[PDB]
Every structure is written in C-alpha cells, then in structure tokens.
Write a protein that binds this DNA or RNA. Structure first.
Lengths: 107, 52, 60, 134, 51
RNA sequence: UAACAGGCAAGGUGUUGUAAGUGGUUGAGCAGCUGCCAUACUGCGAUCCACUGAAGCUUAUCCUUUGCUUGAUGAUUCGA
C-alpha cells in the first residue's frame, strides 16, 4: 500500500471541547494533525489551506462541529525526509453529515 | 442511584403507614468465583498466613 | 400518586418537581423547573408549542 | 404547648431578622424575627425559622398597641422550598405567621390564607382557625 | 416492600419510566412514523424500476 | 488475526422548543395597480398556520452495538 486515501468525518467539537474559547480553535489545526497521525500513523501532516479557511470560517471562537476531510498519504519527493510517508488533509464540503460512513476507497 | 417509593412500617412515628420516598444506590454484582483458600494461625505479633 | 403538571400537562411520578401553593390558595404541581419558570414568567401554556394544552388546541 | 409525635427537619427559611407578613386579623401587618424558640445556637450562626416554628416577634406595621413590643408568633407559610417525606418539595408565595399566645393559643380569630400542614399538626388552635390546611 | 422504582432517565429531567410510556403518551415521531413506512412501502417500490 | 479496540455511523437518552424551503392570502392595511364584462395577480406586508414535538446539540468524563473503517515492529533495564 503506502498510498491510501480515506474520506473520513472527524467530530471536531469533541476534540476541542475542554478548551477555553478564543483558544478553540487554533487547536483544531492541532487536532486535525493528531487525528491524521492516528488513522494514518504518519507524524507528518500537511493541512490544506482550504482547511485553514474553513476552521477559521466562524472566527477564533466558533469552529465546526463535524468536518469531512480526506487524508491522502503520499511519498516525500524533494530530498525525502527521514520518514518517507506524509499525510495531506483536504477539506470536503459535505452538506449533510448524516449516514455518511467512512470510506477507505478514494482514487 | 435511583429512588424507591415505599410505604413505611414503623409504629408511632408520623410516617406510620404513609408512603415515603427514599434514595437508593445500585451495585452491579456478578458472581464471585472461589479460587483458593488461606489459613491463619495465632502468633504473639498478630495473625499469620500459614498455608495457601 | 400521579400528579398532572399545571403548565405542561404531563404526568408526574413521585419525585420530580415542586408544588407551589398560592394564597388564593390554589396548589400548582409542576413537572420540573422549566415549567415552573415559564409559569412565573407568565408564558401561556396554549402558546408554547411543546405542551399538551397546545397539542389539543390543534391536534398538533 | 402542643407537640405530640416528632416533626422532621425542614429547611429553615426565616432568620433573624426577617419581616414576614401577619395573617391574623389582630391588626398587625408585620412580624419581625427577633429570635426562634428552640435555637441553642452556634458561633456566627443566625437563628432561623421555618413552618411551625414559634418565634419571638415585634410588629413593624400595625396597631400602636401592638407595635414596639415583643410577642410570640408561629410561622404558617414560607418561601423556602422544603421536602416532605412523601418526596414533595412544597413552597408558598409569601412568608407569613400569626401572633400567638405563650401556650400556643392563637391571639386573633381568623387566618387569611392557607396554613402549611407541618404547622397545623403541632398547633391545634391554628388548625382550628384556618380555612385550608396545606 | 417497595411500591415503585423510578427508572426514569437520569441524563436530564426524565419524564417517562419505560419507553412504552413515551409512545403511549407521546405518539410516533418523524422517526418510527417514517421508518415503519420506508420498509413496507419500499418492499413494493423496489420492484418499480424492475417492472 | 482482530475472541479486541480506536475513529465514524446508527439507535437510545436528553436539552432547546418547532429549522431551512415551499404552499396557504394567516394577516392590521396599502396618497399600490387593475375593463366594457360583473374581473385579479402580486418580487407589497410584522405576524400566523401546514409539512414539523420539527431542527440543533448530545461525551469530549452520557448509554447500547452484526453497520463502515483502521490496527504485524517500539525502547530501557532486571538472576535466587
């Protein structure tokens, strides 16, 4: 394998709970990272700038509750780092988060 | 915890034969399996586990 | 045993809420605090759309 | 006196010095808690009264032969919710009490409202003078 | 001798003892209304493309 | 290897208390328009009603589990 692409839905308001407002969330950018570090095992996480534009959509106080992302695992290309595999987290604009099961298949 | 309703059975208090609320606690207790035995002798310094 | 809520129209098992006595003196047994608060706030129980008195002014 | 049986500890809503209403037709329009008739006391703790508590009163609005003078009084209603053994938490719209004698005899002749039921089984002559117990 | 044991819901102010009583007092919701009429209806509507 | 967990999801349970859309004239009225034919629509109108006890949130220290999905490795030391 070593190149997988998952389309998953992270319940963000569960991670960023227990954190004070105005600090929820620049921690979502820190929880998208330690979420793509568990489901993909790689400790390198490149967050798409559109994921930034979406986590910062309702300000520093109000973040989404769910969010549907795509974790794409790829190989380092430019003078490969110590770890070959990195994750790239992209934002998927899903209208309804209901009955949306996690799919492991993605081209 | 869950709170019973019961009717009291105590002579002459002023809740005699009148139905009271109590609180109760719930303890999930699934069976003990006995898995060994220990013996204890008397010493002048205490009790002493002898055999297991 | 089973009181009726004077705001929401709900059955009340033992436990579960208050009994405000007025000095008229009418006794009012409420289900929980949400109801009694909306009574003293003088909301009308035919216009909060979740109670039994609203659910028989209409059917719902 | 009047006690037979045993009253349960309810929540004591009326401390020294609360001004409750007088519901007695004696012409007094106030009571004022000076003390409570069984309180032994603890350091910094105020004596407080609940339903069925005899207390020491003055009158702050009322007839001038009742004003400026210590008298005994029994509390018949209160605003602090209190539990009964039946699980009922019951409270009233007003704190009120009635001017009473030294031996539990009520001073006036009528009570303008309901008397709580924990009051009326201690004091028969307050039970005898009220429309609606509880 | 206990007369009654309150098994109402302790995640809030629970109003009903059994889930039957939540369907005796209240009715069917946009829920078991729809889920009891998305099975017997589709069993005669899955063949509508077939026929 | 996957009798197990983690993430979701579904259901429960709650909590706010009727979503958005669409339809109705629901509606106080309109220095608003409109034919002979007596007529009428509105992108005019707070509000109201229907779909709609809806919709939102619900473990992050809530409950349940055939659903979808993931899970071959570490390191330091220790002898009677």
């Amino acid at each position: 394998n070593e190149v997988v692409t998952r389309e998953c839905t992270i319940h963000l308001a569960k991670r960023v709970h227990n954190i004070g407002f105005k600090k929820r969330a620049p921690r979502a950018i820190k929880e998208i990272r330690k979420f793509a570090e568990r489901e993909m095992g790689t400790t390198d996480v490149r967050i798409d700038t559109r994921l930034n534009k979406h986590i910062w959509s309702k300000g520093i106080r109000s973040t989404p509750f769910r969010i549907r992302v795509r974790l794409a695992r790829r190989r380092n290309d430019d003078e490969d780092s110590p770890n070959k595999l990195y994750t790239y987290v992209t934002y998927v604009p899903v209208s309804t988060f209901k009955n949306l099961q996690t799919e492991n298949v993605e081209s | 915890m869950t709170h019973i309703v019961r009717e009291a059975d105590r002579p002459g208090s002023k809740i005699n034969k009148k139905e009271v609320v109590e609180a109760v606690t719930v303890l999930e207790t699934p069976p003990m399996i006995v898995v060994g035995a220990v013996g204890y002798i008397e010493t002048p310094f205490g009790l002493r586990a002898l055999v297991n | 045993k089973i009181g009726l809520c004077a705001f929401s129209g709900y059955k009340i098992y033992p436990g579960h809420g208050k009994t405000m006595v007025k000095i008229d003196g009418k006794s009012f047994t409420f289900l929980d605090k949400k109801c009694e608060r909306s009574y003293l706030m003088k909301r009308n129980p035919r216009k909060v759309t979740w109670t039994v008195l609203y659910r028989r002014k209409h059917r719902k | 006196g009047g006690t037979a049986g045993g009253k349960f500890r309810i929540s004591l809503g009326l401390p020294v010095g609360a001004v409750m209403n007088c519901a007695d037709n004696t012409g007094a329009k106030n009571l004022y808690v000076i003390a409570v008739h069984g309180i032994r006391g603890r350091l910094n703790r105020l004596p407080a009264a609940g339903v069925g508590d005899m207390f020491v009163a003055t009158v702050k609005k009322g007839k001038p032969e009742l004003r400026k003078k210590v008298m005994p009084a029994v509390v018949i209603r209160q605003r602090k919710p209190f539990r009964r053994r039946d699980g009922v938490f019951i409270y009233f719209e007003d704190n009120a009490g009635v001017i009473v004698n030294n031996k539990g005899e009520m001073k006036g002749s009528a009570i303008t409202g309901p008397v709580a039921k924990e009051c009326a089984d201690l004091w028969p002559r307050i039970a005898s003078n009220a429309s609606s117990i509880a | 001798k206990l007369k009654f044991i309150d098994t109402s819901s302790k995640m809030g102010h629970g109003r009903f003892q059994t889930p039957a009583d939540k369907l005796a007092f209240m009715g069917p919701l946009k829920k078991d209304r729809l889920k009891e009429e998305a099975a017997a209806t589709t069993a005669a509507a899955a063949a509508a493309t077939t026929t």
